[PDB]
Amino acid sequence: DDGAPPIMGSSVYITVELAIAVLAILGNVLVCWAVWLNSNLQNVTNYFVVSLAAADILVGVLAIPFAITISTGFCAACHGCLFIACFVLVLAQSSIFSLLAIAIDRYIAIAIPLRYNGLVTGTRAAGIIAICWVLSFAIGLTPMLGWNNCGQPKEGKAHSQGCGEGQVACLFEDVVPMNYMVYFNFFACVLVPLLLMLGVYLRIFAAARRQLADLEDNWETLNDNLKVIEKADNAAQVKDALTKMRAAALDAQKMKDFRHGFDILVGQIDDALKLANEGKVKEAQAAAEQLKTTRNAYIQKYLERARSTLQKEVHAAKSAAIIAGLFALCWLPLHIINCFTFFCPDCSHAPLWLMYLAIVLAHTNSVVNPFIYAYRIREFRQTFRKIIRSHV
Numbered sequence: 333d334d335g336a337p338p339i340m341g342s343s344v345y346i347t348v349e350l351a352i353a354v355l356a357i358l359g360n361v362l363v364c365w366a367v368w369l370n371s372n373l374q375n376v377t378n379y380f381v382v383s384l385a386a387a388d389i390l391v392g393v394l395a396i397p398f399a400i401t402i403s404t405g406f407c408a409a410c411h412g413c414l415f416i417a418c419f420v421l422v423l424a425q426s427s428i429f430s431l432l433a434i435a436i437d438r439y440i441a442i443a444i445p446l447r448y449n450g451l452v453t454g455t456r457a458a459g460i461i462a463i464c465w466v467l468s469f470a471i472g473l474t475p476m477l478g479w480n481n482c483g484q485p486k487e488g489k490a491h492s493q494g495c496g497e498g499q500v501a502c503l504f505e506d507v508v509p510m511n512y513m514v515y516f517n518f519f520a521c522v523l524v525p526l527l528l529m530l531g532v533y534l535r536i537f538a539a540a541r542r543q544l545a546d547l548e549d550n551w552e553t554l555n556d557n558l559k560v561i562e563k564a565d566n567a568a569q570v571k572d573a574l575t576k577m578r579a580a581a582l583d584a585q586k587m588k589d590f591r592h593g594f595d596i597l598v599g600q601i602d603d604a605l606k607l608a609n610e611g612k613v614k615e616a617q618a619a620a621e622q623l624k625t626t627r628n629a630y631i632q633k634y635l636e637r638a639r640s641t642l643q644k645e646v647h648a649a650k651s652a653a654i655i656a657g658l659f660a661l662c663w664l665p666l667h668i669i670n671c672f673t674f675f676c677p678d679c680s681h682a683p684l685w686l687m688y689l690a691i692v693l694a695h696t697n698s699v700v701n702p703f704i705y706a707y708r709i710r711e712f713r714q715t716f717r718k719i720i721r722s723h724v
C-alpha cells in the first residue's frame with residue numbers, strides 16, 4: 333500500500349540482528365575460552381560468569397535466528413510458534429539467575445570471608461547452575477504449558493496469509509499472552525530479582541564501607557591510646573589505656589609474619605600492663621614505647637593489606653553491578669512497552685520501528701559483558717590478549 337515494501341525495513345532489522353549475533357558469539361566464546369585456559373579465572377564467581385556467557389552465546393546461535401523468523405509472521409502450528417517466541421525468555425531468565433548468583437556470591441565473600449571457601453564450592457555452584465537452567469526453561473516456556481493464545485487463533489489473519497488448517501501467522505503478540513508477559517515474566521521473574529540484586533549490592537557496599545571504617549577506627553585507637561600513655565601521670569591511666577589496647581589488638585587479630593606481628597604486639601602490651609599493675613609508671617611508659625616498633629614493622633603492613641583487599645572487593649562488586657545494571661537498561665524498554673500495550677488499551681500501540689529498536693537493544697546486551705570484563709578485570713584482559721595474540 334502507501335507503506336514501503338516490507339522487505340526493505342525487514343532487511344535492515346535482519347542485518348542488524350545478524351551483526352549482533354556474530355559479536356555476541358565471538359565475545360562470549362572468548363569469555364568461556366579465558367576461564368577454561370586460566371586457572372586464576374577458575375573460581376565459583378566465574379562459573380556463573382560462564383553460565384551467563386553461555387546464555388549470551390545462545391542468544392546469537394538460537395534466539396536471534398528465532399527472532400528473525402518470527403518477524404516474518406510465517407504460517408506455523410501455534411505451539412511450535414510459541415517455542416520460537418519464548419525460547420529467548422529462557423535465556424533471559426537464566427541470565428537473571430546467574431546475575432543474582434554473582435551478587436550473592438560477592439556478598440558472602442565480603443560478609444563472611446572466613447567461611448566462604450567452605451560454603452561456596454565449585455561442586456555446589458555447578459549444581460546451582462544446573463537447577464537454574466531447569467527453572468529457566470520452566471519459567472520461559474510456561475506459555476507452552478497452556479498460558480497461551482493458541483485456543484483463540486486470529487483466523488482472519490491466518491486465512492489472508494494462506495495458512496493451513498490448524499496454523500496461525502506466527503507473531504509474538506498473537507500467541508504469547510500479554511498478562512503473562514507483564515505480571516509473570518516482567519513483574520515476578522525479572523523486576524523482583526533485579527530489585528533483590530539491588531538490595532544485595534547495597535548490602536555489599538555498606539559492609540565494605542563499615543569494614544574499612546572499622547580498620548581505620550582500630551588504627552586510630554592504637555595511636556590515640558599510645559599518646560594517652562605517653563602523657564599519663566600515674567599507673568592507673570596507663571593501665572586503662574593498655575587494657576583498651578589489648579582488647580583492640582585481639583579484635584584486629586581476628587600470615588606467618590602477620591601472626592608474629594600480633595603475637596609481639598599483645599606480648600608487649602602484656603609487658604607494659606604488668607609494669608603498670610606494679611605501679612611502675614615510667615617503666616610501663618617506656619615499655620609501651622616499644623609498641624611503636626611493632627606498629628611500624630608489622631601492624632601498618634596488615635592495615636594496608638586489609639584495606640587493599642577490601643578495595644579490590646569493592647572494585648569487583650562494582651564491575652558485577654555494572655553488568656547487572658546494563659542487563660536492566662537493555663531489557664527494560666521492551667518490558668515497559670509491553671506494560672503500555674497491556675495497561676493502556678486506549679493508547680496507540682508502540683510503532684513497529686520502536687518495537688524492533690527495543691528488541692535489538694535487548695539483544696545487544698549479549699554483546700556487552702566481554703567488554704566490561706576486558707575493561708575492568710585485569711586477569712580477563714590479560715588472558716584475552718594472550719588468546720588473541722597466540723590464536724588470531
Ligand SMILES: Nc1nc(NCCN2CCC(c3ccccc3)CC2)nc2nc(-c3ccco3)nn12
Pocket residue numbers: 420421424503504505513666667670681682683684687688691
Ligand atoms: N511485545 C513483543 N513483540 C515482539 N514482536 C512483535 C513486534 N510487533 C508487535 C506488534 C506491533 C504493532 C504496532 C502497531 C499496530 C499493531 C501492532 C508491531 C511489532 N517481540 C517481543 N519480545 C518481547 C519480550 C521479550 C522479553 C520481554 O519482552 N516482547 N515482545
Ligand SMILES: CC(C)CCC[C@@H](C)[C@H]1CC[C@H]2[C@@H]3CC=C4C[C@@H](O)CC[C@]4(C)[C@H]3CC[C@]12C
Pocket residue numbers: 407408409411412413415416
Ligand atoms: C540443538 C539445536 C541446534 C536444534 C534447534 C532446533 C529448532 C531449530 C527446532 C526445534 C523445534 C522446531 C519447531 C517445532 C514446530 C514448528 C511448527 C511448524 O509449523 C513450523 C516450524 C516450527 C516453528 C519449528 C521450527 C524449528 C524448531 C524451533
Ligand SMILES: CC(C)CCC[C@@H](C)[C@H]1CC[C@H]2[C@@H]3CC=C4C[C@@H](O)CC[C@]4(C)[C@H]3CC[C@]12C
Pocket residue numbers: 409410411412413415
Ligand atoms: C532431546 C532434546 C535435545 C531436543 C530439544 C527439545 C526441543 C528443541 C523440541 C523437541 C520436541 C519439540 C516439540 C515436538 C513437537 C511439537 C508439536 C507441534 O505441534 C508444535 C511444536 C512441538 C511442541 C515441538 C516444540 C519443540 C520441542 C520441545
Ligand SMILES: CC(C)CCC[C@@H](C)[C@H]1CC[C@H]2[C@@H]3CC=C4C[C@@H](O)CC[C@]4(C)[C@H]3CC[C@]12C
Pocket residue numbers: 661664665666668669672679680681682683686
Ligand atoms: C529503561 C529506560 C532507559 C527508560 C526507557 C523508556 C521508554 C521505554 C519509554 C519512554 C517513553 C515511552 C513511550 C511514551 C508514549 C507512547 C505512546 C503510546 O501510544 C504507546 C507507548 C509509547 C510509544 C511509549 C513506549 C515506551 C517509551 C518509549
Ligand SMILES: CC(C)CCC[C@@H](C)[C@H]1CC[C@H]2[C@@H]3CC=C4C[C@@H](O)CC[C@]4(C)[C@H]3CC[C@]12C
Pocket residue numbers: 523664668671672675676
Ligand atoms: C524500578 C523501575 C525501573 C520499575 C519499572 C517501572 C515500570 C513498571 C513503570 C514505569 C512507567 C510506568 C507506566 C507509565 C504510564 C502508564 C500509562 C497508563 O495508562 C497505564 C500504566 C502505564 C503503562 C505505566 C505502567 C508501569 C510503568 C511501565
Ligand SMILES: CCCCCCCC/C=C/CCCCCCCC(=O)OC[C@@H](O)CO
Pocket residue numbers: 379380382383386394454455457458461465
Ligand atoms: C533448543 C535447545 C538449545 C540448547 C539449550 C541448552 C541450554 C543449557 C546450557 C547450559 C550451559 C551451561 C554451561 C555453564 C558451565 C559453568 C561451568 C561449571 O559449572 O563448572 C564448574 C565446575 O565444573 C567446577 O567444579
Ligand SMILES: CCCCCCCC/C=C\CCCCCCCC(=O)O
Pocket residue numbers: 392393397398400401404405406407
Ligand atoms: C553458528 C550457527 C548459527 C545458525 C545460522 C542460522 C542463521 C539464519 C538466520 C535466520 C533464519 C531465517 C528464517 C526464515 C523464516 C522463513 C520465512 C517464511 O517462511 O516466510
Ligand SMILES: CCCCCCCC/C=C\CCCCCCCC(=O)O
Pocket residue numbers: 463467470471
Ligand atoms: C515453575 C516454577 C517451578 C516449581 C518449583 C520446583 C521445585 C524445585 C525446587 C528446588 C530444587 C532443589 C534441589 C534439590 C536437589 C535434589 C537432587 C537429587 O534428588 O538427587
Ligand code: NA
Pocket residue numbers: 384387388423424427697698
Ligand atoms: Na543475557
